[PDB]
Write a protein that binds this ligand. Structure first.
Ligand SMILES: Cc1cc2nc3c(=O)[nH]c(=O)nc-3n(C[C@H](O)[C@H](O)[C@H](O)COP(=O)(O)O)c2cc1C
Ligand SMILES: Cc1cc2nc3c(=O)[nH]c(=O)nc-3n(C[C@H](O)[C@H](O)[C@H](O)COP(=O)(O)O)c2cc1C
Ligand SMILES: Cc1cc2nc3c(=O)[nH]c(=O)nc-3n(C[C@H](O)[C@H](O)[C@H](O)COP(=O)(O)O)c2cc1C
Ligand SMILES: Cc1cc2nc3c(=O)[nH]c(=O)nc-3n(C[C@H](O)[C@H](O)[C@H](O)COP(=O)(O)O)c2cc1C
Ligand SMILES: O=C(O)C(O)(O)C(F)(F)c1ccccc1
Ligand SMILES: O=C(O)C(O)(O)C(F)(F)c1ccccc1
Ligand SMILES: O=C(O)C(O)(O)C(F)(F)c1ccccc1
Ligand SMILES: O=C(O)C(O)(O)C(F)(F)c1ccccc1
Lengths: 333, 333, 333, 333
């Protein structure tokens, strides 16, 4: 594999069509799904030359811990859909690569088991109709050694996935929500309840409006993820990468600002960094690699991404991620 | 049916080619027809998160009455062209859905019969060479219980429909203008004559210039429809959605501002609302549903649109249409 | 024929490939040829409603005489290439339609014969290496009753026509330059020599820079044609329609400002007018009609264009060409 | 051959696929490769009319010597890959055409032999891990009569060429680095070492950031090449032509400013000049001509380019390259 695009084809071959569609699809006409890619492709980097590259490092410090790349594995539900070892395979590879892994509320392996793998586990929270269950999940995650709560705030309910509707897609009975034995819309009061219930940094995932980013900082969030949920929620929602610069300026260092949606290479990581992001999340490509070759597949993906990030940073004259954030960009056609 | 696009294919199958062309076509090279869609697709919404969605409502108050959605059925002539029950089928479905239905001057069922169906009938007026006939139509409409006069102002004469010319399209003899037993260009004097002759709100349909919107308010119009007539009049006329924001700002609450042209989903409705529209008109899709399955087809269309509007509003953090109008947007590529 | 596009296909059928290529082609990669169309298609008109249309007129006064449309036939060399009757057929149709016809320096019928047809003949001048021959042509044109000298200023030499080079295209021996029994670059001194030698208005064709338009007025030109020569001279030259607005503003009524390049409908004429043009030139479509059906073909073309111009003007609320020049426009995608 | 595009097809036929890919390809997804062309195609020239063209000259003075065109042959490694005579064939043709030829550090014929050909040889330098070898190359080049040192500054290491990786491309054993019997990242200290070691003008190739251009002048560079290395280094790097205008303004005559990337015609040369460039480099097309017909092929290419430059300049009203730099441009779609 010399690019992430190699993996998608491999995954399409092995996966049942209905499952590949669940993974690949977006909501409505998939306008926001496509726009995530279009938006990245319009961004060009202005590289710097002739700087010291004797010790190029791709490492960052985030939420108290060192990470090997400015990157984490995005929360993706029911990973046993893509491979028998599911979340355990991905978590093991992420651990080995020094990249944070985000355990899902809807993981098909329990959060305690995934956390036992080690590494840098974060935990993604969906707000539940029974609030006490949501706060219990948070407590479970913290007890199991998760380092951050990624509170998903753009899913008051699931978007309308036309591929899934057309396929009549449903969870195979061999895939379950292992954390349970349903959703409620989250509000700012929900965020406060979570913040008061944990010492872990709370990260609001799915922020797109500048004033929501400001309010996130005021609410005590340790980070936000600028995101339209991979084009899977509001169809017609602006791509996060189009809002990123404005949001980074507005929060003015008040919290970590992550972005996701369409990151498909080290060059894309460089673009996000240059626009001001602390780090990116990567979703579908990690699942392509999992589907294609299990744990070893994800390992290969992360090794490829690591080399592409180092390459891009050096070619752009950046010895550190901090330097990459000070790069300028130019919009193209 | 999970999208409006499902309906168009169904309608293409059942309709004679010449009739589908009458419905689908625009004037000239159909530049303005295509531009209505292109313009909507360039608009992206910036959604808000973490707001109270306990009582999401899609209802609006317009021209004195509550409507179930920020939407009305656009005036479309000769609906018996598409289905034997014609206007009666559409009006019944609209009534049941709580959506205003616009009775046409050129309806293939008399306006009194359509009005007898009940619901929220509006009446669309074409100015006639004999002025007295036009004012008589207005009186008939008011007597029959219509709630608004939609005065079409962008048809001094019909545009050049090249599909119709090439097909040699003509009304089948089983389709007639049931309100009669011809056009004259309307002027601002015509508007005043109508306004003086009725207590009903007068709505000017086909406004695109900012100063025409201003003058509409000065002329005592209760509303305007920002519209290039679905690309069927001036070929090269700007899409209404491109003028909407500027017009909403200029009239500064002085009348209702509706828009139409290319609305094909709840997400499109959200975009129009976010740009400032009070409500939208939907034309061709209603006729697709009518052609495909008569009254039940239109019912299904309106139910689908209702769910898509609620979904879009909630995902964008809007508990009311008023909230949706305060959303910001961003132009994309 | 219901559009100009109908004619092009007809002409492609009947013409030898090499001759159709001479007519259709541009210089270099034909970037400027394509850009003339792209530029027009990006322009949208903001129409006005509810104005008096009782006496819509498409007539203009230009260079002392009334014309039936804001349009003239562009100079096109060697018209016997396209039809046996060549320039005589086109001139007769133009006369009958009340549209000025531009006699070429390189006409395949003598300028005296074409002028004898009557109507509103203009004469297009190429500057010749022997200056006295050029001034003699001007005198001949004036004596024969031509009403304007269209001095072509963007051909110091002919551009590189790759279609012609690839075809090894050459004039058939049955086609000659009937005004003769060669080119020199024109300068501002050449313009002055022409102006001093005639009482006719001098029109500089091929102006694209704003300061060249200013200087044209200072030099005593009665008009200019904003033009990149139909994409046949400098490949990469900006389309005239993209410079038109700026040029109209700069000359501030000091001379007539015409435009050409890609005018293919009445709607296109409306766009040019709305951008400030006094009138347009139409080139290739007139030759399509000539090739397709001789004099009657051109007559049909001009009748179609006349109806399209009236239609567009009325639908845009313009009772006169002057009103059309006060229309606003909006750039689209 | 009537255009450079003719040559590429000829070269594709004769070259082994792996070698054509080495020549044609870029890094990553080849976004920057494509963008070089897209960026040029968006630029339109505003030509001037009616100026004196009695002595049109395409000559420039650069780095102390007259050149026949505002153009030099770009450094391209291992030219024996494309033709048995390799660099000698290209250098001979360039000499005959009065165009500077850039001898590569990785030439497949020694720099002394290529320099012996005569003409205007420049020498391109890659910084070596052993610094003394790099300074020795500089001394060798100066002793052999090279007139400028083109220090490549955008290759701390080679970019990721996915075509090459997929092909498993490697140098055939009959092709060697003839200057040797490896790379180190260059810094501003390296530039200073070179500048102190030679009296020749030092030209920094691969500058894209405005402040790097400023610093180049401060560092004593005699020129820069605004360049993203033909899309072969950082994938996503902005095209040089998009940065050119801003850079020309910032250096304010302090050094020569060259540009490369996608120059494929005399018209493209005119565009670069109009944006402010002193001269352009041309890379891949020279190799197409070499592959297609050896020395005579390159001669034909340079003759074609010379005619296209003269043509473009004259049609734009420019009697000199200096005049061409004062042309205005307009961005299109
Ligand atoms: C199949 C699938 C399942 C997902 N499940 C969740 C989830 O449970 N919670 C969440 O916050 N985001 C979820 N996401 C969104 C991702 O976290 C992330 O925002 C998005 O996938 C990133 O875009 P990318 O896939 O283009 O890299 C899911 C995405 C996909 C494709
Ligand atoms: C077949 C057809 C007939 C129409 N008849 C009328 C009419 O009689 N009066 C009128 O004001 N608008 C008429 N319209 C325009 C619609 O009211 C409306 O402006 C347009 O269709 C909305 O665009 P949409 O079809 O993309 O939703 C007609 C449109 C179509 C397609
Ligand atoms: C075949 C052909 C011959 C032309 N000959 C002349 C000419 O002799 N003198 C001149 O000023 N323009 C000449 N033109 C340019 C036209 O006058 C005019 O600028 C251009 O054709 C208008 O663009 P259009 O063809 O898209 O309408 C010629 C154009 C064509 C296509
Ligand atoms: C096959 C190939 C080899 C190249 N080798 C070098 C090189 O050794 N040193 C260098 O500075 N640039 C090198 N370049 C880049 C060119 O000097 C130049 O920047 C680029 O090719 C210009 O773009 P163009 O090919 O579109 O004209 C090479 C380019 C190609 C295609
Ligand atoms: O986008 C997703 O797939 C999600 O995991 O965030 C979800 F919660 F919306 C979802 C959607 C469908 C099935 C399961 C979970
Ligand atoms: O756009 C229409 O179809 C119209 O109903 O508004 C009309 F009046 F222009 C028309 C056009 C053709 C046939 C009937 C009515
Ligand atoms: O663009 C033309 O075809 C022209 O008529 O203006 C011309 F003079 F450049 C020309 C070009 C080729 C053959 C004859 C005349
Ligand atoms: O871009 C090139 O091909 C280069 O010559 O500049 C190089 F040095 F990067 C290179 C790349 C691959 C093989 C040899 C040289």
């Amino acid at each position: 594999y010399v690019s992430l695009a190699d993996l998608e084809r491999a995954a399409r071959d092995v996966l049942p069509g209905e499952i590949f569609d669940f993974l690949a699809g977006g909501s409505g006409t998939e306008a926001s799904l496509v726009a995530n890619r279009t938006a990245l492709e319009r961004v060009f980097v202005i590289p710097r030359m002739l700087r010291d590259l004797t010790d190029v490092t791709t490492e960052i410090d985030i939420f108290g811990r060192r990470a090997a790349l400015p990157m984490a594995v995005a929360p993706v539900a029911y990973q046993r859909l893509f491979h028998p070892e599911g979340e355990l395979a991905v978590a093991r590879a992420a651990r080995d690569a020094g990249v944070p892994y985000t355990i899902c509320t809807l993981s098909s392996v329990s959060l305690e088991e995934i956390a036992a793998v080690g590494g840098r586990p974060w935990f993604q929270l969906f707000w539940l109709r029974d609030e006490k269950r949501s706060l219990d999940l948070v407590r479970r995650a913290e007890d199991a050694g998760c380092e951050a709560i990624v509170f998903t705030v753009d899913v008051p309910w699931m978007g309308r996935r036309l591929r899934d509707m057309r396929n009549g897609f449903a969870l195979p009975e061999w895939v379950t929500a292992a954390n349970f034995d349903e959703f409620a819309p989250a509000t700012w009061e929900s965020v406060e309840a979570v913040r008061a219930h944990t010492d872990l940094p709370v990260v609001l995932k799915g922020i797109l409006a500048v004033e929501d980013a400001r309010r996130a900082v005021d609410a005590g969030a340790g980070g936000i993820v600028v995101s339209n949920h991979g084009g899977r929620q509001l169809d017609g929602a602006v791509p996060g990468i189009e809002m990123l610069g404005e949001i980074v300026a507005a929060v003015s260092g008040g919290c970590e600002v992550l972005v996701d949606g369409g990151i498909r290479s080290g060059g894309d990581v460089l673009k996000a960094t240059a626009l001001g992001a602390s780090a990116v999340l990567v979703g579908r490509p990690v699942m392509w690699a999992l589907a294609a070759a299990g744990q070893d597949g994800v390992r290969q993906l992360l090794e490829l991404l690591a080399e592409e990030v180092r390459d891009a940073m050096g070619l752009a004259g950046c010895e550190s991620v901090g330097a990459a954030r000070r790069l300028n960009t130019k919009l193209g056609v």
